[PDB]
Amino acid sequence: SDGDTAMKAFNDTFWDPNAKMFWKDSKREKHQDFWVEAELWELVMDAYQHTSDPALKAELKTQIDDVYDGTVAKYGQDWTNNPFNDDIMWWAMGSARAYQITGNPRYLEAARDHFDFVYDTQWDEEFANGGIWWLNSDHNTKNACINFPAAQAALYLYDITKDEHYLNAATKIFRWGKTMLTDGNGKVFDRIEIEHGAVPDATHYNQGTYIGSAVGLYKATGNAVYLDDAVKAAKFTKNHLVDSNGVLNYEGPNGDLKGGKTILMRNLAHLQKTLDETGQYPEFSAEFDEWLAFNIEMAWSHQNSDHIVDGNWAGQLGTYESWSSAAAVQALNGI
Ligand SMILES: *[C@]1(OC[C@@H]2[C@@H](O)[C@H](O)[C@H](O)[C@H]3O[C@@H]23)O[C@H](CO[C@H]2O[C@H](CO)[C@@H](O)[C@H](O)[C@@H]2O)[C@@H](O)[C@H](O)[C@@H]1O
């Protein structure tokens, strides 16, 4: 469908061309959190790939560079002092994508140096036979929100570099996460803690990065089991993390989860594209396409007069937030 109207509205409402960052909300008092800015960077990249408007395309090309420059101006070039390994990995993954799109070597160095720091210092086999720690300050839990994004980042690095080290990393992370952070049936657990074990709370963004890593590992290897793993996690999402009418849930008020549909929709588009160009899971592909279209139309129907959609897609039409509002824009820029 049209993703151009939604992307331009999002930029008009939230982009700060002075700081080269998105505002956190329409009160324009604070810029977006560090990790979420990486996900809005990926949204700009997805809209760049989706649009057929050469004017908007050229604007988004410049914006891909600006989002990086604005974050580096505030946080510096070296993010390895951030205690959240997931914050570092969201940026390493965005930087890998920026290189795939542009070939600007600065984005390969940012991706590789941040990925290497996390994988080389935060992968551990002492606890639970594998997995990356959530934090580099304290080691108490290993989480879906670092492990699956790390597998995805390693798969982008393998595509760019052809260095089998990165496919090895992706495979080891994903196999460990499938074993320790899922039920084997498509449900992705939040985390596994040293004292209390697995925490089997499922969320949009952890289903999403699991599906994206499984699809990426299917594309790298040709092994149909990884695509089956992705389809099971997609089916779980469609059958559990929805309301009684099939609309994806609103996961607020938690600020990190409120915009999680953005990451889910990005990765569900990857799966849709792979099913469409392979003839895999034909009955599911048709039902998946109908359910995605239903959700995207519900989101479209929830737009305000400025073409901004808050994250409560099933609810009635205040201050708008860039992370909650990103999910509809992503949904309309599927690649
Ligand atoms: C903790 O994570 C917050 C965020 C991440 O969302 C993000 O990856 C970011 O880069 C880094 O700053 C951290 O909270 C997340 C949400 O926790 C709540 O929901 C879950 C799922 O229902 C629940 O299990 C928790 O108890 C919280 O109620 C969580 O997804 C992360 O794993 C971290 O625990």
Residue numbers in the entry: 39 to 355, 358 to 375
The paper states:
GH76 enzymes catalyse the hydrolysis of α‐1,6‐mannans, such as those found in the yeast cell wall, with net retention of anomeric configuration. In 2015 their 3D structure and putative catalytic itinerary were identified revealing ‐ in the case of the Bacillus circulans enzyme ‐ five enzyme subsites “‐3 to +2” (using the described nomenclature) with Asp124 acting as catalytic nucleophile and Asp125 as catalytic acid/base in a classic Koshland double‐displacement reaction. We show, notably through mass spectrometry and high resolution 3‐D structural analyses, how the disaccharide cyclophellitol is indeed a poor inhibitor, but how the trisaccharide versions, in particular the carbasugar‐stabilised one, potently inhibit B. circulans GH76. We used a more easily crystallizable variant, R341Q, designed to prevent formation of an intermolecular salt bridge due to crystal packing and allow ligand complex formation, but which is otherwise unchanged in catalytic machinery and efficiency.
Disaccharide analogues are rarely the optimal inhibitors for endoglycosidases, but trisaccharide analogues, by virtue of their length, are necessarily also substrates lessening their potential for enzyme inhibition and application. A soak with the trisaccharide 2 revealed a mixture of partially occupied trisaccharides and hydrolysed disaccharide product, with the latter again occupying subsites −3 and −2. The refined structure (whose interpretation was rendered far more facile when subsequently viewed in Iight of the complexes D125 N with 2 and 3, described below) showed low, partial, occupancy by a covalently bound sugar in the −1 subsite with the C1 position refining to approximately 1.55 Å from the OD2 carboxylate oxygen of the nucleophile Asp 124. Further examination of the electron density map calculated after modelling the covalent species revealed the additional presence of an unreacted epoxide in the −1 subsite. Given the clarity of density for an α‐1,6 mannobiose in the −3 and −2 subsites, which was sufficient to allow refinement of fully occupied disaccharide in these sites, the presence of mixed di‐ and partial trisaccharide species clearly highlights the challenges of the unmodified trisaccharide inhibitor on this system.
